[PDB]
Amino acid sequence: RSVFSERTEESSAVQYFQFYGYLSQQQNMMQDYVRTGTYQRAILQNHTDFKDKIVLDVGCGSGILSFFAAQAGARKIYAVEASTMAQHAEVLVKSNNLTDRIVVIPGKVEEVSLPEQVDIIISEPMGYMLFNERMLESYLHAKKYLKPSGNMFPTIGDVHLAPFTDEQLYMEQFTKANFWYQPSFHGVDLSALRGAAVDEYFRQPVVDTFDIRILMAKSVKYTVNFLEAKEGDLHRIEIPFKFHMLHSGLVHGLAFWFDVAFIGSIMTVWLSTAPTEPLTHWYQVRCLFQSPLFAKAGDTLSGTCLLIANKRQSYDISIVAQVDQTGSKSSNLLDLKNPFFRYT
Amino acid sequence: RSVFSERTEESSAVQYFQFYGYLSQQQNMMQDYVRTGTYQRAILQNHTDFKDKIVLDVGCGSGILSFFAAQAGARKIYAVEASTMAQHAEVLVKSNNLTDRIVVIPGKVEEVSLPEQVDIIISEPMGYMLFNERMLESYLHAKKYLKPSGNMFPTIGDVHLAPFTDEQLYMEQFTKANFWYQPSFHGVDLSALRGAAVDEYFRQPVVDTFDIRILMAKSVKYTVNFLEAKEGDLHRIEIPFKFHMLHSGLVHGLAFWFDVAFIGSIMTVWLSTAPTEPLTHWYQVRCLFQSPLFAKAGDTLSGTCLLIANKRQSYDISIVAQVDQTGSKSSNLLDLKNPFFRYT
Numbered sequence: 001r002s003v004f005s006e007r008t009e010e011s012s013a014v015q016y017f018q019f020y021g022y023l024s025q026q027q028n029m030m031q032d033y034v035r036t037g038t039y040q041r042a043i044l045q046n047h048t049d050f051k052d053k054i055v056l057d058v059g060c061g062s063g064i065l066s067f068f069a070a071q072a073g074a075r076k077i078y079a080v081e082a083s084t085m086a087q088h089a090e091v092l093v094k095s096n097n098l099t100d101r102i103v104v105i106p107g108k109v110e111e112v113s114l115p116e117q118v119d120i121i122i123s124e125p126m127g128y129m130l131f132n133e134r135m136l137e138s139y140l141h142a143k144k145y146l147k148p149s150g151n152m153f154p155t156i157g158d159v160h161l162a163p164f165t166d167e168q169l170y171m172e173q174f175t176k177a178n179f180w181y182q183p184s185f186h187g188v189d190l191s192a193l194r195g196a197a198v199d200e201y202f203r204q205p206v207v208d209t210f211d212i213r214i215l216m217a218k219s220v221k222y223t224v225n226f227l228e229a230k231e232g233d234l235h236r237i238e239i240p241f242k243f244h245m246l247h248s249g250l251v252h253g254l255a256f257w258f259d260v261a262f263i264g265s266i267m268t269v270w271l272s273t274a275p276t277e278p279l280t281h282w283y284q285v286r287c288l289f290q291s292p293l294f295a296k297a298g299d300t301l302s303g304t305c306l307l308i309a310n311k312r313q314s315y316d317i318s319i320v321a322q323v324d325q326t327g328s329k330s331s332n333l334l335d336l337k338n339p340f341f342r343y344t
Numbered sequence: 345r346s347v348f349s350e351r352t353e354e355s356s357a358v359q360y361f362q363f364y365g366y367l368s369q370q371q372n373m374m375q376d377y378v379r380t381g382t383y384q385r386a387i388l389q390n391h392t393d394f395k396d397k398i399v400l401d402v403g404c405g406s407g408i409l410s411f412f413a414a415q416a417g418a419r420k421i422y423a424v425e426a427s428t429m430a431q432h433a434e435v436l437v438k439s440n441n442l443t444d445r446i447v448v449i450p451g452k453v454e455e456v457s458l459p460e461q462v463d464i465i466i467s468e469p470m471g472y473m474l475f476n477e478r479m480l481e482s483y484l485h486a487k488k489y490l491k492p493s494g495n496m497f498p499t500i501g502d503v504h505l506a507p508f509t510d511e512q513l514y515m516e517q518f519t520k521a522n523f524w525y526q527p528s529f530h531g532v533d534l535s536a537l538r539g540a541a542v543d544e545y546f547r548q549p550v551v552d553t554f555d556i557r558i559l560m561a562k563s564v565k566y567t568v569n570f571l572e573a574k575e576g577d578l579h580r581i582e583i584p585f586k587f588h589m590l591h592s593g594l595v596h597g598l599a600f601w602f603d604v605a606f607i608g609s610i611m612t613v614w615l616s617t618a619p620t621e622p623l624t625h626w627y628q629v630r631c632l633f634q635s636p637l638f639a640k641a642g643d644t645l646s647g648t649c650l651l652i653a654n655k656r657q658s659y660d661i662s663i664v665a666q667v668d669q670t671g672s673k674s675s676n677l678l679d680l681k682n683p684f685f686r687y688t
């Protein structure tokens with residue numbers, strides 16, 4: 001028993017760490033230039049937060065962030081990695097002649113032993129919609145190793161949500177589902193499953209990007225301060241919203257993105273996944289409503305987005321929304337574990 | 345516990361049956377017109393093999409093949425399905441007014457109880473390169489329920505292999521692996537992992553289609569007779585080959601496809617996934633050599649393809665090949681579980 005094993009189905013964990021054991025998957029993240037370059041910038045431009053310091057890298061993967069901490073002058077970097085990627089990180093530490101400074105520790109951060117407390121924790125634990133993968137909890141957990149007044153890079157995370165209109169995306173779900181609305185598919189009446197098919201498609205958050213013109217109101221922001229938050233704070237995430245509609249139209253759902261800030265002694269550096277910013281491997285995420293809501297400019301769209309952590313390293317998403325002026329309401333349940341990857 | 349649980353890692357099984365629980369995935373198979381239409385043809389044109397007979401459908405999914413057995417006049421059809429798709433099949437059986445003839449039985453065919461021995465077993469248990477998923481073993485296992493001189497649909501399966509030349513494919517995989525040849529990726533020397541990266545990328549069989557002109561020799565055929573084979577026969581599959589090269593050039597690997605035959609009392613019907621035939625959702629599969637072999641027209645390319653079943657419902661593929669005239673040899677290990685889907 002650890003904190004990780006207690007919150008995670010073994011079958012989910014096996015698949016998860018298998019995925020990250022692939023060099024190709026580490027490469028995918030590494031080649032996201034906005035991601036990798038911003039981390040390097042955050043670390044190097046805040047060199048005083050690393051110079052002669054003790055560092056923990058939570059989920060080091062290839063080791064890339066630990067190498068940046070080394071470039072910034074860290075004395076010692078504990079690089080923790082639970083997948084078989086830990087073996088490859090070790091190879092790189094030796095080939096880059098950094099054995100005196102980067103120590104790879106294979107295992108889950110919730111299960112390993114560190115020899116000493118650290119000045120600063122670095123990690124890239126963000127998933128889709130920020131919270132997917134539940135690795136933010138591992139990052140917060142790692143604070144048991146943090147010296148008092150130690151730092152976290154990133155320091156804070158902001159989730160943004162905004163209502164969108166996208167009639168073509170909405171309609172696409174019914175078109176797919178209507179495969180089932182055939183009374184004689186090779187002589188078989190499939191129609192009884194059409195509703196189940198619709199339900200299945202609407203349960204998948206949509207991962208892709210979009211034009212900012214689809215957004216119908218200024219975003220609402222939910223902030224997690226990684227210096228102050230406890231792991232338990234991420235088990236149930238309640239995001240109330242009150243959108244003041246800037247455009248009239250049919251609201252088909254809520255769009256999500258996230259930013260993180262590295263609040264260093266020299267400067268604050270932001271990594272944004274917003275649709276106004278260059279694209280990242282996180283794209284953006286949209287959660288559809290099964291019934292859209294009509295709203296006019298100046299109306300208020302109010303409700304709650306409730307994210308409930310599950311044992312498959314993800315979240316059950318519940319979105320309830322109403323147009324206050326008409327009482328028209330929509331209620332939606334989504335499975336963040338299994339998004340629809342729409343981008344092309 | 346059961347023959348299934350003994351040969352299968354739980355984490356693999358969970359993911360596998362989750363996949364097939366999706367209506368979208370059942371739809372993907374159902375909409376393969378060559379697949380679904382050829383099954384219907386095989387069954388209906390051999391109506392005497394079904395008329396007033398008892399049938400087992402191994403892995404019924406939506407129920408579609410059981411409906412075809414019903415159309416052909418079967419008295420009773422036991423439709424076994426281990427995913428939650430079984431519940432959707434039940435719905436269709438009721439909505440098609442076939443409750444008197446199709447009996448859905450939720451569970452693994454190696455764990456359920458059938459009330460009764462059967463005249464004929466129908467299944468679509470073919471994966472990529474025929475053997476992926478190890479469902480052919482469940483199909484063979486189901487023969488414990490088959491009456492003496494009962495039939496199997498499909499009855500036999502042929503795997504074809506042929507050498508191919510495709511420099512562009514080769515270079516694409518090598519280009520991706522060569523990400524890890526860089527001496528200064530954001531200042532970090534990745535080159536110590538280049539060999540491991542080549543191994544990983546070359547370990548992935550390539551799923552897509554191709555022009556038949558890339559083939560350098562007539563195919564070699566390996567046949568599995570489903571009437572006679574035992575599940576244990578699929579644990580280690582040894583396919584010797586001796587290709588008489590028709591064209592001179594660089595051999596970049598072996599291409600694989602498969603056919604199955606439904607040997608009925610009225611006629612034999614073939615389902616082919618060959619690159620000479622209309623495309624199916626199985627496409628074709630190519631196993632690259634890390635280093636290509638030069639051969640001249642008239643040379644012999646000889647060796648063995650060895651498929652060793654693993655607990656992740658797939659196979660470790662070993663391909664050893666040599667050009668007899670020069671002694672040039674290539675030895676390759678591939679992981680059929682995790683193919684590169686290139687057609688997308």
Ligand SMILES: Nc1ncnc2c1ncn2[C@@H]1O[C@H](C[C@@H](N)CC[C@H](N)C(=O)O)[C@@H](O)[C@H]1O
Nearest residue numbers: 020029059060061081082083107108109124138
């Ligand atoms: N609980 C955990 N303990 C240790 N490592 C973990 C844990 N959870 C996730 N990881 C690893 O964290 C890494 C997360 C990656 N997104 C980041 C890799 C790398 N730090 C990079 O920035 O490129 C993966 O390699 C996971 O295997």
Ligand SMILES: Nc1ncnc2c1ncn2[C@@H]1O[C@H](C[C@@H](N)CC[C@H](N)C(=O)O)[C@@H](O)[C@H]1O
Nearest residue numbers: 364403404405424425426427451452453468482
């Ligand atoms: N051991 C097993 N016991 C019961 N069902 C299985 C087993 N292995 C695989 N399956 C199911 O077999 C089905 C395989 C599909 N290729 C076929 C579905 C359907 N018969 C069709 O032809 O459309 C999936 O629905 C799996 O969930």
